[PDB]
Amino acid sequence: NVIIGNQKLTINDVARVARNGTLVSLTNNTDILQGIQASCDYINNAVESGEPIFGVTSGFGGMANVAISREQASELQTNLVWFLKTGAGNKLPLADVRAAMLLRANSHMRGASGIRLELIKRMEIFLNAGVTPYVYEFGSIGDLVPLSYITGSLIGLDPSFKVDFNGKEMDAPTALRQLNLSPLTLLPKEGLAMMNGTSVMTGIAANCVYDTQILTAIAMGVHALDIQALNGTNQSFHPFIHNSKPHPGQLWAADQMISLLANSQLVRDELDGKHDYRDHELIQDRYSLRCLPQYLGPIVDGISQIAKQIEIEINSVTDNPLIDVDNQASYHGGNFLGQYVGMGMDHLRYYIGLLAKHLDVQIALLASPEFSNGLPPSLLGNRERKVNMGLKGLQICGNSIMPLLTFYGNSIADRFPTHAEQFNQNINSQGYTSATLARRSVDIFQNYVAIALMFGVQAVDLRTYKKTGHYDARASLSPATERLYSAVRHVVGQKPTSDRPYIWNDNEQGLDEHIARISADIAAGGVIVQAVQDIL
Amino acid sequence: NVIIGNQKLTINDVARVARNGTLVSLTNNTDILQGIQASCDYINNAVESGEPIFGVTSGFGGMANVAISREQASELQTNLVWFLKTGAGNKLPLADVRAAMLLRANSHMRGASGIRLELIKRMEIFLNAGVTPYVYEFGSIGDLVPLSYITGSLIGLDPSFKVDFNGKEMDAPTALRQLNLSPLTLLPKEGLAMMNGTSVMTGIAANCVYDTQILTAIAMGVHALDIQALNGTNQSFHPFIHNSKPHPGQLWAADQMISLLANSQLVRDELDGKHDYRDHELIQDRYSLRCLPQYLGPIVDGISQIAKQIEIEINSVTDNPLIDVDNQASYHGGNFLGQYVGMGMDHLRYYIGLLAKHLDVQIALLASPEFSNGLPPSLLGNRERKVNMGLKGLQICGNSIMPLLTFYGNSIADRFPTHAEQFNQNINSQGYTSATLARRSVDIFQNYVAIALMFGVQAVDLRTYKKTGHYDARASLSPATERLYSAVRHVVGQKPTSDRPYIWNDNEQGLDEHIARISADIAAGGVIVQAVQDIL
Amino acid sequence: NVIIGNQKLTINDVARVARNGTLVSLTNNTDILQGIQASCDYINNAVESGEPIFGVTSGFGGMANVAISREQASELQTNLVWFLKTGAGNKLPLADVRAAMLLRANSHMRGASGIRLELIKRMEIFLNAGVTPYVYEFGSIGDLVPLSYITGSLIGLDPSFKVDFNGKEMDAPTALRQLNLSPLTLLPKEGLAMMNGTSVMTGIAANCVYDTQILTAIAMGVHALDIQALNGTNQSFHPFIHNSKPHPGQLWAADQMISLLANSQLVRDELDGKHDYRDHELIQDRYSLRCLPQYLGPIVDGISQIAKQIEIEINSVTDNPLIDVDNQASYHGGNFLGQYVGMGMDHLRYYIGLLAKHLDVQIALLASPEFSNGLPPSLLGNRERKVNMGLKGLQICGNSIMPLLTFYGNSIADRFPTHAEQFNQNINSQGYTSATLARRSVDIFQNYVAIALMFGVQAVDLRTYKKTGHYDARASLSPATERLYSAVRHVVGQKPTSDRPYIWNDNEQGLDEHIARISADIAAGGVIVQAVQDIL
Ligand SMILES: O=C(O)CCc1ccccc1
Ligand SMILES: O=C(O)CCc1ccccc1
Ligand SMILES: O=C(O)CCc1ccccc1
């Protein structure tokens, strides 16, 4: 159970609540609760005293010059939900909305937001009950409009607000009746407390980072399989090389490779600096093998940097104005700008493209007899069935997906419109669509990694057959990559045996079904993910 | 003075040597000098014993399958200079080439490259004598070809090598004569020791990072001028706001802006928390002022991350193979792949475009009476000459430059050709052209920042006039921005005066001349750079 | 000789005047010359009568709300030169500036601009005398600022204007003195007549289109060399194939390749339709040969479309307001927006990157023995000197240039700033920087094509040798590609000979010198350009 108010949330915390339905509860720490209440009292007294506060006793953004009376102060926040009910396009994944709610709640616990504890708690109840508001993919320039949908569902403002109640679509007032809750009415500032901020884009981004850390670990395993299938050397990953060029990510990737290849019987074992003289001539490994740590270093380091930045944002107070009860003051600031998210997700998409292109080049070596060091063309299985073309179709599909991934590696934060919202929002982060685009990259990268996994699994079977009599690669692989191999072969439903490789005749499988099954297992955190669990 | 190989080099160190002609010397540490010699010993014995070593007793890259005898091993390295080099197209700044020679020599001191000390010393001599080999902008997929022009010049291989000898173009053999040096012939491995590696792209990147750090400080100062001109508040930068979203770069940007604005007579001083008129009523600032530290944060942190990555690359051993004397072995590795440089410069150009775009929307506020809070249209000075249009042309020029900077913020590392060099280099970093594009970005950004300074300086004069009798902003400005303001007007040669603003009639200056003077001063590290020295 | 305004100007016409110094003269057509005078008459009466006309009796752009009297109307135009111009940063090729003055003068002959004939004649005098005003590369969001440097120079406004007087830098007033001309002062509207419009960006674009058409022809010739070197078939270009997919550009590319390859002794001549060995068995060509006309088609048609669009822009009236003498009226319109240029150059740069990428994969086939069908590795000439590595360095340099060209194939028109010039210019074309980026693209492409020519020439020599006794490819080549081959080797100064290929030892040339010579020749319209003259 994740406790919200007392500690810092991690990306892993957010993914557990978001995807695994881990329960959540608000802290009962007495000072935190008091800070929450103090914040509301300050706002209550300011409104009554006719203190002028943008968005609380006056209008919003470019219409903040519009005066709002005390009698209309609550109605201002309520109406904020209505004129923001303007989303468009497809729905977010529920897991992203759950993440959004968890972050919104966390942000309120700091007590600078002036929102009722009963309203914070409503997010805890939705999360634990399995109620997820629908939220559209269009509407935020980086999260008013997405958040208004969460807000209107929480307070049950109107039947046009829809929720998913454990797989059941229904309207929000109906959901409140089932939970035995009452409709809520927003008090001054509460609308801004719910809707001003970065919770959705950061929630999306958090899940993207989690998914990409996992996909990177799996990618490392694929490369390890590729290297073993190509009969490449492990000399490339020797600590002496990387200690003298000590980028943290290069160091890490090289050292992870040593572990991944340790006790393999398929690599050239040359860590003593000397050629093994076991095949018919001396081979040098191409750059995609030799320069693998240098290439992945900045990606590994970048993802780690994004993860650090996204975790600050997770634990940030992001609405506005901010209430300082210690000095009885409020400040008109800008924490609702999700610039670390916009730029971070630009970087992430770019990194995913770089990962994919490197993997596709490995596949090009495996598939091509000129470069595969003895592997059959296109990793053909049954040689006596001449019509067999092996994994030729699977490569083309790989070739169709990677460039799309580099395409999404283009940036969007730099294309923000400077005329936005009556020229009030003349900079903005484009963080929201940047995050949804990242979700798209990650989803596509999951299919891509599935394909790469299939190539590596076939390939080590065929290499094993070259080295030994037979096709069961389990004995021959390094123990670390044996777990992944076996996990893939389990998920796909094709057991390793000494007499057949993973793929034998083109006739005997739909490769598409194997792609879908591996992808689904990666996304679910199945045995493939668990196989590479130790690569942090 | 800068001692090469007993201490890590910083980016400041590199810029001092490259730009300011700081003297350089090789360490006399007895241990270091033995490492350098032991490395040569190992190699020249390995070759004499007929060990197979790629690139040393064998051909290069895709032609590593070609065996090279004991007797041709030396000529192998000499010929590498001929086919490699002399593949080049257009021409790079001498300071970048000086940076490269410093980096190359620095990497050799580690004692793993198997290169003669007198070859290393020749880079020291060239640096202190001011002999700079000509290097072309095309030829490296990320430094064989660039480094070979340096190598051919150092050893005085042929008259077709041009150097710049403190201003004098010469052929290299002639430069050697005047320095009283003999030509050198490369021994086995020494060609690779000179031409394998990331020294030139990293040399370029290092100067770019240094310049971009300077421009970020100046940009901070420009924003501080803009805010004062616009009668903005300092409330947005209150630490209560930023402590509750504690990204390091955001915290830093807000704190710096507090310092930059302290004791200004031109800002609305609302750090109390409460409002009221010295203008309209209540005034709400637009996002480009209010969300400034949120926006600059990831740019600041990003430049800092690149800085840290480039300093590691600066102090790395990047040639190949690497000689490990303690275990008497060579390793065929890949430290010549400068992925941190190709990706880092992709990020740098992207950050610079975001800085420029933000500055440009401040210029839009300043120029437009709807948004300037009482400044004249286009920062017009003499309103009585009605044909005056003020800084309208200056704005258009700004508007033409900023989009070009976001254009250069496109990435190039992801567009690497997988068929490079006989399909041997099937991944590569594009780090060299990434770095020269960054240089182009930085150079354009110096022009842009010049314009933005001109806008800020004019504007505070006009705001001062609105407020007081006069046009001399020096007394009204925060002391921090007064330093910058005076420095700018010192450079353009237009003295502050209580009777006239910086720009009075359109008649009286070529603004093009002011831009050029301010840019030159920024490039030379002049008084404008010295005014913002405080900003780390 | 080129007569300005009684005939449409073509892109050939523009290049002849800009590059070859062709003499120019204004039409003496009595009707045209009356139109020009009637236009001035209308305007100078309208002003004298106090008509409100934007930019004529009122301020400019966002300051059009400022009224300008009869008495200051002339000074209004003179001052436009001062605030506009003199907003500029870095410097453009004289030929582009000559193109601009031709275009500007050409637009005035239509008689709708209200500008004095002696002002128009001054562009004629400058062109024929070889006086070229200095113009900077920054300042236009797509030509006020560039055109104002031309204007100030033409009228001799101030010594701060520099011109190039056939090689001599001068101030403009001094150039006027030597030409025996008086300074001019602008009359109402004449400033706009000179500085409103798309003449400079279109002048640049025109030279780019001309150069790109040349390089496309040369590229066709390079492919024809590549195909012959690779022992490719001409079957792929059979009209039965292309008639059944009849895109004009594809039809054209296939037919041209048939001509380029006719009577070659180096291709497999399979236009019959049936196969067989003069090699392996049956040989299938890869897509870069087989799909060549399908690939080049849209590039060819695209360049042709741009050509047609630019010629309309060339012959357009682009200033404002436009005087319609027949109805005695002015129209406030928008012909100064050069969207066809900003978008056309976006497309051009994109096409050029696609041409380069295609050429680069041919170079990969040539360099690699797995794919070259029997050519030596890296097109090595003297195989007995084992330290020779042939064109390996040349390939790497090619590999560094091509990705930069696809990089410049990114677009800039979509990145226009909507806040430009007091929010008056809330759309703009970015046409000027689009065009200067195209110039940068074209210039880099000339270097790239040089490399590709060097590869093709070497390769056919080596293929000829495989086939016959000797290295002289002249007899074996199709007559069409023999012209190109000889032209290239004339330029680099290495005569075909039966005993030695173009490149024998790495020892014996600086390949950098060959690239530079071939590029210079391509730029100057030399023998290499004349060899491919036949390709329309
Ligand atoms: O704080 C601001 O400047 C904008 C707040 C806001 C709230 C709801 C809609 C638009 C803007
Ligand atoms: O593969 C390598 O490590 C060397 C590649 C290379 C290519 C051309 C010249 C020197 C080295
Ligand atoms: O809006 C227009 O048509 C003119 C814009 C303009 C701006 C600055 C100088 C001349 C014209």
PDB file of N, CA and C in Angstrom, chain C residues 55-106:
ATOM      1  N   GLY C  55       1.228  53.073 -45.698  1.00  0.00           N
ATOM      2  CA  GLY C  55       2.631  53.083 -46.069  1.00  0.00           C
ATOM      3  C   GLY C  55       3.056  54.255 -46.934  1.00  0.00           C
ATOM      4  N   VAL C  56       2.102  55.091 -47.337  1.00  0.00           N
ATOM      5  CA  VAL C  56       2.381  56.200 -48.240  1.00  0.00           C
ATOM      6  C   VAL C  56       2.055  57.530 -47.561  1.00  0.00           C
ATOM      7  N   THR C  57       0.869  57.606 -46.971  1.00  0.00           N
ATOM      8  CA  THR C  57       0.507  58.731 -46.126  1.00  0.00           C
ATOM      9  C   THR C  57       0.209  58.220 -44.732  1.00  0.00           C
ATOM     10  N   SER C  58       0.865  57.128 -44.371  1.00  0.00           N
ATOM     11  CA  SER C  58       0.697  56.561 -43.053  1.00  0.00           C
ATOM     12  C   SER C  58       1.918  55.718 -42.717  1.00  0.00           C
ATOM     13  N   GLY C  59       2.110  55.421 -41.435  1.00  0.00           N
ATOM     14  CA  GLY C  59       3.191  54.553 -40.998  1.00  0.00           C
ATOM     15  C   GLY C  59       3.092  53.137 -41.555  1.00  0.00           C
ATOM     16  N   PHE C  60       4.056  52.296 -41.188  1.00  0.00           N
ATOM     17  CA  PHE C  60       4.204  50.964 -41.771  1.00  0.00           C
ATOM     18  C   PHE C  60       3.789  49.865 -40.800  1.00  0.00           C
ATOM     19  N   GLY C  61       3.165  48.819 -41.330  1.00  0.00           N
ATOM     20  CA  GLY C  61       2.835  47.638 -40.548  1.00  0.00           C
ATOM     21  C   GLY C  61       1.949  47.903 -39.349  1.00  0.00           C
ATOM     22  N   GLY C  62       2.425  47.503 -38.177  1.00  0.00           N
ATOM     23  CA  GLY C  62       1.702  47.725 -36.944  1.00  0.00           C
ATOM     24  C   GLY C  62       1.598  49.190 -36.560  1.00  0.00           C
ATOM     25  N   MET C  63       2.322  50.063 -37.262  1.00  0.00           N
ATOM     26  CA  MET C  63       2.224  51.507 -37.010  1.00  0.00           C
ATOM     27  C   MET C  63       1.623  52.260 -38.189  1.00  0.00           C
ATOM     28  N   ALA C  64       0.761  51.570 -38.931  1.00  0.00           N
ATOM     29  CA  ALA C  64      -0.019  52.164 -40.009  1.00  0.00           C
ATOM     30  C   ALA C  64      -1.090  53.129 -39.501  1.00  0.00           C
ATOM     31  N   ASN C  65      -1.312  53.139 -38.193  1.00  0.00           N
ATOM     32  CA  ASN C  65      -2.254  54.062 -37.561  1.00  0.00           C
ATOM     33  C   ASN C  65      -1.657  55.462 -37.367  1.00  0.00           C
ATOM     34  N   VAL C  66      -0.396  55.630 -37.748  1.00  0.00           N
ATOM     35  CA  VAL C  66       0.267  56.920 -37.646  1.00  0.00           C
ATOM     36  C   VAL C  66       0.148  57.682 -38.960  1.00  0.00           C
ATOM     37  N   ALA C  67      -0.531  58.829 -38.942  1.00  0.00           N
ATOM     38  CA  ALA C  67      -0.780  59.595 -40.164  1.00  0.00           C
ATOM     39  C   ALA C  67       0.421  60.429 -40.601  1.00  0.00           C
ATOM     40  N   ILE C  68       0.671  60.421 -41.899  1.00  0.00           N
ATOM     41  CA  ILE C  68       1.809  61.112 -42.471  1.00  0.00           C
ATOM     42  C   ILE C  68       1.325  62.146 -43.466  1.00  0.00           C
ATOM     43  N   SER C  69       1.672  63.399 -43.211  1.00  0.00           N
ATOM     44  CA  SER C  69       1.229  64.494 -44.056  1.00  0.00           C
ATOM     45  C   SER C  69       1.856  64.481 -45.444  1.00  0.00           C
ATOM     46  N   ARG C  70       1.309  65.329 -46.297  1.00  0.00           N
ATOM     47  CA  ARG C  70       1.849  65.636 -47.608  1.00  0.00           C
ATOM     48  C   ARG C  70       3.342  65.944 -47.524  1.00  0.00           C
ATOM     49  N   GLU C  71       3.682  66.770 -46.546  1.00  0.00           N
ATOM     50  CA  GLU C  71       5.002  67.374 -46.450  1.00  0.00           C
ATOM     51  C   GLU C  71       6.085  66.404 -45.971  1.00  0.00           C
ATOM     52  N   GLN C  72       5.693  65.371 -45.234  1.00  0.00           N
ATOM     53  CA  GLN C  72       6.663  64.408 -44.722  1.00  0.00           C
ATOM     54  C   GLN C  72       6.618  63.078 -45.472  1.00  0.00           C
ATOM     55  N   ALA C  73       5.786  63.003 -46.508  1.00  0.00           N
ATOM     56  CA  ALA C  73       5.547  61.769 -47.235  1.00  0.00           C
ATOM     57  C   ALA C  73       6.798  61.266 -47.940  1.00  0.00           C
ATOM     58  N   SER C  74       7.614  62.188 -48.427  1.00  0.00           N
ATOM     59  CA  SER C  74       8.841  61.817 -49.117  1.00  0.00           C
ATOM     60  C   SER C  74       9.898  61.333 -48.132  1.00  0.00           C
ATOM     61  N   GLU C  75      10.083  62.089 -47.053  1.00  0.00           N
ATOM     62  CA  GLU C  75      10.987  61.711 -45.979  1.00  0.00           C
ATOM     63  C   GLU C  75      10.590  60.364 -45.366  1.00  0.00           C
ATOM     64  N   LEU C  76       9.287  60.067 -45.367  1.00  0.00           N
ATOM     65  CA  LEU C  76       8.784  58.789 -44.866  1.00  0.00           C
ATOM     66  C   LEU C  76       9.479  57.621 -45.568  1.00  0.00           C
ATOM     67  N   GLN C  77       9.532  57.702 -46.897  1.00  0.00           N
ATOM     68  CA  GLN C  77      10.149  56.673 -47.715  1.00  0.00           C
ATOM     69  C   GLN C  77      11.665  56.620 -47.534  1.00  0.00           C
ATOM     70  N   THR C  78      12.299  57.784 -47.389  1.00  0.00           N
ATOM     71  CA  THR C  78      13.747  57.851 -47.202  1.00  0.00           C
ATOM     72  C   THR C  78      14.126  57.234 -45.858  1.00  0.00           C
ATOM     73  N   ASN C  79      13.294  57.467 -44.854  1.00  0.00           N
ATOM     74  CA  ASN C  79      13.582  56.965 -43.525  1.00  0.00           C
ATOM     75  C   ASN C  79      13.362  55.464 -43.388  1.00  0.00           C
ATOM     76  N   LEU C  80      12.470  54.930 -44.216  1.00  0.00           N
ATOM     77  CA  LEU C  80      12.230  53.495 -44.302  1.00  0.00           C
ATOM     78  C   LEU C  80      13.537  52.764 -44.602  1.00  0.00           C
ATOM     79  N   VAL C  81      14.330  53.365 -45.461  1.00  0.00           N
ATOM     80  CA  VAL C  81      15.633  52.844 -45.801  1.00  0.00           C
ATOM     81  C   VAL C  81      16.489  52.781 -44.516  1.00  0.00           C
ATOM     82  N   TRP C  82      16.394  53.787 -43.650  1.00  0.00           N
ATOM     83  CA  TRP C  82      17.235  53.820 -42.447  1.00  0.00           C
ATOM     84  C   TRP C  82      16.867  52.820 -41.345  1.00  0.00           C
ATOM     85  N   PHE C  83      15.594  52.650 -41.023  1.00  0.00           N
ATOM     86  CA  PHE C  83      15.276  51.802 -39.873  1.00  0.00           C
ATOM     87  C   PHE C  83      15.212  50.329 -40.257  1.00  0.00           C
ATOM     88  N   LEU C  84      15.176  50.059 -41.558  1.00  0.00           N
ATOM     89  CA  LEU C  84      14.860  48.732 -42.077  1.00  0.00           C
ATOM     90  C   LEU C  84      16.090  47.947 -42.259  1.00  0.00           C
ATOM     91  N   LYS C  85      16.668  48.239 -43.396  1.00  0.00           N
ATOM     92  CA  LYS C  85      18.074  48.079 -43.583  1.00  0.00           C
ATOM     93  C   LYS C  85      18.737  48.511 -42.324  1.00  0.00           C
ATOM     94  N   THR C  86      19.963  48.046 -42.169  1.00  0.00           N
ATOM     95  CA  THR C  86      20.815  48.435 -41.097  1.00  0.00           C
ATOM     96  C   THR C  86      20.169  47.748 -39.946  1.00  0.00           C
ATOM     97  N   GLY C  87      19.503  46.640 -40.252  1.00  0.00           N
ATOM     98  CA  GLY C  87      19.038  45.706 -39.245  1.00  0.00           C
ATOM     99  C   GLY C  87      19.666  44.345 -39.522  1.00  0.00           C
ATOM    100  N   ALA C  88      20.568  44.294 -40.458  1.00  0.00           N
ATOM    101  CA  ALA C  88      21.096  43.057 -40.959  1.00  0.00           C
ATOM    102  C   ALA C  88      22.319  42.362 -40.321  1.00  0.00           C
ATOM    103  N   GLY C  89      22.378  41.010 -40.377  1.00  0.00           N
ATOM    104  CA  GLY C  89      23.495  40.100 -40.005  1.00  0.00           C
ATOM    105  C   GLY C  89      23.941  39.039 -41.046  1.00  0.00           C
ATOM    106  N   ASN C  90      25.243  38.622 -41.114  1.00  0.00           N
ATOM    107  CA  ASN C  90      26.053  38.025 -42.305  1.00  0.00           C
ATOM    108  C   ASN C  90      25.594  38.018 -43.892  1.00  0.00           C
ATOM    109  N   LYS C  91      26.489  37.582 -44.780  1.00  0.00           N
ATOM    110  CA  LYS C  91      26.686  38.079 -46.138  1.00  0.00           C
ATOM    111  C   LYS C  91      26.576  37.226 -47.409  1.00  0.00           C
ATOM    112  N   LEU C  92      25.752  37.668 -48.304  1.00  0.00           N
ATOM    113  CA  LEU C  92      25.420  36.844 -49.453  1.00  0.00           C
ATOM    114  C   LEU C  92      26.123  36.956 -50.839  1.00  0.00           C
ATOM    115  N   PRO C  93      26.130  35.871 -51.631  1.00  0.00           N
ATOM    116  CA  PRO C  93      26.932  35.799 -52.862  1.00  0.00           C
ATOM    117  C   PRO C  93      26.504  36.866 -53.853  1.00  0.00           C
ATOM    118  N   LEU C  94      27.446  37.463 -54.571  1.00  0.00           N
ATOM    119  CA  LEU C  94      27.117  38.584 -55.442  1.00  0.00           C
ATOM    120  C   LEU C  94      26.090  38.198 -56.520  1.00  0.00           C
ATOM    121  N   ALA C  95      26.160  36.965 -57.005  1.00  0.00           N
ATOM    122  CA  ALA C  95      25.262  36.491 -58.054  1.00  0.00           C
ATOM    123  C   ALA C  95      23.810  36.490 -57.606  1.00  0.00           C
ATOM    124  N   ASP C  96      23.581  36.127 -56.353  1.00  0.00           N
ATOM    125  CA  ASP C  96      22.232  36.200 -55.814  1.00  0.00           C
ATOM    126  C   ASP C  96      21.761  37.658 -55.763  1.00  0.00           C
ATOM    127  N   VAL C  97      22.642  38.578 -55.368  1.00  0.00           N
ATOM    128  CA  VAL C  97      22.264  39.988 -55.329  1.00  0.00           C
ATOM    129  C   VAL C  97      21.997  40.545 -56.733  1.00  0.00           C
ATOM    130  N   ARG C  98      22.800  40.149 -57.719  1.00  0.00           N
ATOM    131  CA  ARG C  98      22.528  40.521 -59.112  1.00  0.00           C
ATOM    132  C   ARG C  98      21.177  39.967 -59.598  1.00  0.00           C
ATOM    133  N   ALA C  99      20.843  38.747 -59.198  1.00  0.00           N
ATOM    134  CA  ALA C  99      19.547  38.159 -59.551  1.00  0.00           C
ATOM    135  C   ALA C  99      18.406  38.991 -58.990  1.00  0.00           C
ATOM    136  N   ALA C 100      18.548  39.396 -57.735  1.00  0.00           N
ATOM    137  CA  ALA C 100      17.550  40.236 -57.077  1.00  0.00           C
ATOM    138  C   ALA C 100      17.313  41.547 -57.811  1.00  0.00           C
ATOM    139  N   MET C 101      18.374  42.200 -58.280  1.00  0.00           N
ATOM    140  CA  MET C 101      18.196  43.508 -58.906  1.00  0.00           C
ATOM    141  C   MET C 101      17.523  43.335 -60.252  1.00  0.00           C
ATOM    142  N   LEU C 102      17.832  42.241 -60.936  1.00  0.00           N
ATOM    143  CA  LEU C 102      17.137  41.927 -62.180  1.00  0.00           C
ATOM    144  C   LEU C 102      15.641  41.715 -61.925  1.00  0.00           C
ATOM    145  N   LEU C 103      15.324  40.971 -60.876  1.00  0.00           N
ATOM    146  CA  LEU C 103      13.925  40.671 -60.565  1.00  0.00           C
ATOM    147  C   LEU C 103      13.158  41.928 -60.125  1.00  0.00           C
ATOM    148  N   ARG C 104      13.739  42.699 -59.215  1.00  0.00           N
ATOM    149  CA  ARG C 104      13.152  43.955 -58.776  1.00  0.00           C
ATOM    150  C   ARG C 104      12.805  44.868 -59.956  1.00  0.00           C
ATOM    151  N   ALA C 105      13.796  45.138 -60.801  1.00  0.00           N
ATOM    152  CA  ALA C 105      13.574  45.952 -61.984  1.00  0.00           C
ATOM    153  C   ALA C 105      12.521  45.327 -62.883  1.00  0.00           C
ATOM    154  N   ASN C 106      12.483  44.006 -62.949  1.00  0.00           N
ATOM    155  CA  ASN C 106      11.541  43.366 -63.856  1.00  0.00           C
ATOM    156  C   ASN C 106      10.116  43.585 -63.397  1.00  0.00           C
TER     157      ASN C 106
END
